[PDB]
Design goal:
Butyryl-CoA Dehydrogenase, subunit A, domain 3; transit peptide (chains A, B, C); alpha+beta; Butyryl-CoA Dehydrogenase, subunit A, domain 2; flavin adenine dinucleotide binding (chains A, B, C); homotetramer; 3 domains; binds dihydroflavine-adenine dinucleotide; four-stranded antiparallel beta sheet; 386 residues; glutaryl-CoA dehydrogenase activity (chains A, B, C); Butyryl-Coa Dehydrogenase, subunit A, domain 1
């Protein structure tokens, strides 16, 4: 017999170092995270202590060069994301935010002082970052954001609210995007600055094993040096999103794979009408169709990773993978749950948890519809968002 | 503008008393249950005190005659289930179990003594019933059940485990189905009988606002009089399931309607890219497609109810409704959630809760695949379960 | 065993006169049309003499009163359309055009003299009508039409081109819609009028057993009396479309039923791997899913017909049926073909022919997307066509 | 750059070398200049002229992945790209080539004697002779193990009796590879089509693959010498090995029909105005275009992946099933969806989508139905066969 991706033979597309990274992260997930995940999800906690475990593993800022970062290629970051999310999307979300959003914002747009202050600590998981773009009234359309930075002498004064901010209540530093007299700018906000409050969001059905927050900035005063000096316009936060989105292209496949392998095993173990469930045509149809989507998504992820490591990948190319792999992953998790029957309604087997988590992954970092329309613009030359 | 079912004009198919029942139950849901459902779901409880509230409302055993039961037609019972499930599937599940499973088992197969002892209290919600058919190893195939009742003189001794039993930990009496030397039989088990233990199931992601239990029967000794005297073979429990399934055909539509109406209101209020979300083609596509399925399902529910009242409805006819209305309802809830964006991931707006709940509804009272194959058998004359 | 609609028991929703009409038309189709349809499709012909057979049967203008028309209710007209299309969509298309487009245009908007000139012959099939609305450049948006009718004294002169006009080359009289200085108006154009040319369309893959034409109007001069006196604005042609669309709501279900019943019979007779094809789960899944859509569509059609016969049916209500029933019918025809294997690629068994014909039905009388957006506007109050 | 073609957006050309891209371009230009001007008439009239055999032979596509005998000796990825371009023309063009190379020639190349190879392969490669492959019977298609055509020994000679059905090129062929049951199991025979007792009857009134010859073969007391047996073919494995070669071509070919449909339709949406703007400007249109592009590109990545495995250690049947199941069913969905965007104009032979969709009905069914490939994948994942 073959595992779903073994049937496709996606491993032939990876070198030994890449395969070793995947195996290493998978082992970490199996030993350190999997035994605790059901309780973390039920209780709606993801302990701050995991930051150091992820730091020590090497995954925080792993695609970045220097500052104690691993300095891997893009494919390797993707595989790590895939393995984290196979554990739980909350694990991958923590890492997406730390590396591709927080650390990348500083790496790409920061001063030397900012890079030297924060990057080693963030790489080690000794500090935690967050990325405040979305607001209650603006998610898909961040160009409309209302958070505002005004100058007071050489200082800045920030006022606004950000919403749905992963790690907001855990962070030491927030990368906050705000309108200014000269256009959108980014600021590093120490989270102990007076006027800065993070309020944790509870009663989530998705991403319970994750910290998600409202950030309220009430006359937050910062020095001139707090601005990320190179970030100008919406292109700056969007560049960070394109790094994180790349990780999600791989990550969603991990949730899908974990669901599907767990469910194939269940079908072998469960007898219905005196035969294993895996013996019936209806079961095999589902397993085959799900396998076909998972393998196509893995081929697409690796393809995009190879482009990224060569000349770079364009946003509309990332959109192929973000649109496809998240929507096909949530379909796989949901279909798997049907094969588990009653046993599938609890936290015992991963599919329903994965499906719930993937609701957030479908929406964040650009909704399916935003990516759909980005592809449509690339094919036609006509923007149809408005 | 039209509400989805208003566009179909399904009200024209209903008489005044039926429409009044729907309105009465909807007002009860809105006032007594909706203010509390978010907390009930989060904390995984459905208070036992609701038994008396449902009893006083008149919905427990409402389609039965006598014993303080309402004696309504089948369409009215359907509409009540639709309105209860629009609140939450846990509300409708409580009522399905109390009336169509527990009370119906006693009404149809019980002695006069059993009916007089239990039916008035169950109708009033002064006692709670449960129905123990499913076992850890046998759900879709109850013919294979291994709970056993053996004779000891004129007494019976029951041994087995039932699983996924709604209201198990709240019930005063359990209808327990068991194999015997002469075939499947049913027994009324007072829940304080020595050897009978109910263990509540926790860490559910679906039907959290509902009590679901394991029942362990360890040499439970009963008198001859505890047997349901008229129940012989699998036909007896299945007749109860067909009563309950009928209610679910309507119930699932309630969860779908509540999701859809909530979501339409959200799309009218939420502005994206300077216009209400409801203005966009992609939004209207979703709203129209969902409306089309909801109305078709409503026509099918009413059609089946009219058949049931006029002449009885066959199991394979119920299967049309149970297969269709549950799977289309869960699709509607899921698609609604996408339109809500990030706000849809919490308990604030009903779609994600309804989607999760409908995972159980899809599986219980015969999975989609069971109803699919029952329809296949009716069309071809060939059973394809084995 | 049950036929698909027998399992639903849609016959219970009809009276005996209605059921008798369905049976009469089915017998006519089976005896007079079916033995010839494969040759007609292959040769791309539909003999003009069939007009008289349809006329004698009573289906031409059957829902109209007087003028030798049958004067049936709307449900009966729907059932006749269903049975005609079960034969072939080209048969139903002939009847849709003759009755609901041509004759209804004259009946509803025509003068006393026009009605007496044409309605009795059109009802008998001794004359043939057509309906010229669509232009090469304007189909979904007939408000944009450019055929123009101008005055010259009391005469009218029409100039423009109509396209995809069913029966154009066969018609004695054409109802032609044109823009004027005062808005859209309608005209009865005898097809021997100087300047009026019909050119037949060939190399169709859909609706080969049907005549479809280009109409070229080169300054066609008519008397004042040729105007349909009561037709003003786009509402007039659309009212005719709404009559024809209603018949299509039923008609598409006939193509679906014919495909499905033919395919069920094939699966019972075809042995694969030593058992009838109907015995396999994959087969039964398809048969069951297709049955579910066919029956839901039938319930919707009958519901719309009862509304139509009472206070009248609104366009957006018709859109529910036209959107749903055509797109579900083409899916049934296509899925059926897969079950036939190689034998399904020829004209021997109806599915592939039906699927091809339904391509036209999906597009004409308002595309799926037009009906979709019509429903969206009803739900939201916002038009999203532009 | 303001716009990208669907596969340009994926950048699948970066996965191909110059020689491979040159082959695609060469076959595309042949299809555009020689075949496309005639395809509408050929489909309507239900003809595919036999002269095309020599034209395909001269082009180099007949037996292109085979070595020797005047064959091109290309890699498998190049054969795939040629099939993609032929099918973008019409599936009947690709079907001709599938049968000639991967079924007829390959049967002889793999299982034949030296004498058979020398007699037939050079002519077949050149398109100076035409071959066909008779596996399917009226009663047995998805289950060829159940075939009833029989070969019985008469001394040193053979006598064959049976009927084959749905045989591409049957009425044009000079030689038929005919699969038959024997006392010792399934065997293969080269049957010259002028052998007394061998008759080919052409199938008419097709709605799919009208620009292709499809036949019934009837064998009544067909006598053959011992030398007519393919000596190395034993059991169902032999015909299935031929199918696995042809199926690989189809994994690519179906994408050609999809691409041709989709690019034709994107161009139409750019030029067609509805409600005062190009049809391409609307969200509903862009939704369709994007979803179809996503499937086309995923399919192309899968095809190239399978080709690279084939040119390395080799592709297993269940891996080919991934491609055949996926790419054909997604291609037919693309062609159908494209047709909706064309409106009325899409119902004729003018624009390719409806013709492609009809042709793909055959492609979905032949060389193993979607359900056969689905269940082969299921068996690979579970270790349980669910055919019976
Ligand atoms: C758990 C979790 C965690 C995070 C985040 C979300 C969640 C749920 N996000 C926020 C996330 O990026 C945000 O939810 C998405 O951008 C979507 O925006 P809204 O939720 O406002 O939906 P919004 O209101 O924009 O969209 C609602 C619906 O409208 C549709 N739509 C929008 N525009 C349309 C158009 N023009 N045409 C048609 N349809 C259109 C959308 O596709 C969607 O279906 C975030 N943010 C952040 O800054 N930092 C973070 O760390 C995180 N993390
Ligand atoms: C919250 C909740 C509440 C309740 C219940 C469940 C849940 C989740 N049920 C139990 C319920 O009826 C049961 O879950 C279903 O019958 C399905 O059985 P299993 O969960 O054992 O799945 P099972 O293991 O039977 O099926 C697993 C999967 O295999 C598929 N399958 C099964 N047979 C097949 C075949 N022959 N061919 C192909 N596929 C096949 C199924 O469709 C499903 O997808 C119950 N029970 C009870 O007695 N009293 C109660 O009050 C309740 N309430
Ligand atoms: C065989 C046959 C027979 C007939 C007819 C057609 C055919 C094929 N019709 C013509 C028919 O009514 C016409 O084809 C449809 O109205 C669709 O118009 P177009 O073909 O111009 O497509 P058009 O160019 O309008 O539309 C093309 C595509 O764009 C989509 N689209 C259009 N507007 C859009 C928007 N605002 N947003 C998003 N998408 C949009 C459509 O849904 C479609 O998918 C006819 N006519 C007649 O007058 N008399 C007759 O007898 C017949 N009979
Ligand atoms: C135009 C064209 C051209 C060719 C061919 C076909 C056509 C249409 N073929 C024949 C082709 O290979 C054949 O049609 C397929 O193998 C399918 O077999 P049947 O048509 O007998 O369907 P069959 O009767 O086997 O199958 C009918 C349906 O049942 C399903 N089914 C079968 N077994 C099942 C099971 N166990 N469980 C569930 N479902 C099952 C199938 O998937 C299908 O949906 C051929 N042949 C050849 O030898 N040489 C050639 O050149 C060609 N060329």
């Amino acid at each position: 017999t073959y595992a779903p991706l073994e049937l496709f033979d996606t491993d032939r597309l990876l070198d030994q170092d890449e395969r070793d990274i995947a195996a290493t992260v998978r082992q970490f997930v199996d030993t350190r995270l999997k035994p605790n995940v059901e309780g973390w999800f039920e209780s709606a906690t993801l302990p701050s202590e995991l930051a150091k475990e992820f730091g020590n593993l090497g995954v925080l800022g792993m695609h970045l060069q220097g500052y104690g970062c691993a300095g891997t290629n893009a494919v390797s970051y993707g595989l790590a994301c895939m393995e984290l999310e196979a554990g739980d999307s909350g694990f991958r979300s923590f890492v997406s935010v730390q590396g591709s959003l927080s650390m990348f914002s500083i790496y790409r747009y920061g001063s030397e002082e900012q890079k030297n202050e924060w990057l080693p600590r963030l790489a080690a998981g000794d500090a935690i970052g967050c990325f405040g773009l979305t607001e209650p009234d603006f998610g898909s359309n961040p160009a409309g954001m209302r958070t505002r930075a005004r100058r007071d002498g050489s200082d800045w004064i920030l006022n606004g609210t950000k919403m749905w901010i992963t790690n907001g209540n855990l962070a030491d530093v927030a990368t906050v995007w705000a309108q200014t007299d000269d256009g959108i700018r980014g600021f590093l906000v120490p989270t102990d600055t007076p006027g800065f409050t993070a309020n944790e969001i509870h009663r989530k059905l998705s991403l319970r094993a994750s910290v998600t927050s409202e950030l309220v900035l009430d006359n937050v005063r910062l020095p001139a040096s707090a601005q990320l000096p190179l970030a100008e316009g919406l292109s700056a936060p969007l560049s960070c999103l394109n790094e994180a989105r790349f990780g999600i292209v791989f990550g969603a496949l991990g949730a899908a794979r974990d669901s599907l392998e767990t469910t194939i095993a269940y079908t072998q173990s469960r007898e219905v009408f005196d035969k294993p469930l895996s013996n019936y045509q209806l079961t095999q149809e589902k397993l085959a169709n799900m396998t076909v989507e998972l393998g196509k998504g893995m081929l697409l992820a690796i393809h995009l990773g190879r482009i990224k490591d060569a000349e770079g990948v364009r946003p509309e190319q990332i959109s192929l993978g973000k649109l496809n792999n998240v929507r096909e992953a949530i379909a796989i998790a949901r279909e798997c749950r049907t094969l588990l029957g009653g046993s599938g309604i609890t936290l015992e087997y991963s599919p329903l948890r994965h499906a719930n988590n993937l609701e957030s992954v479908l929406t964040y970092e650009g909704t399916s519809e935003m990516h759909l329309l980005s592809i449509g613009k690339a094919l036609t030359g006509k923007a149809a968002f408005r």
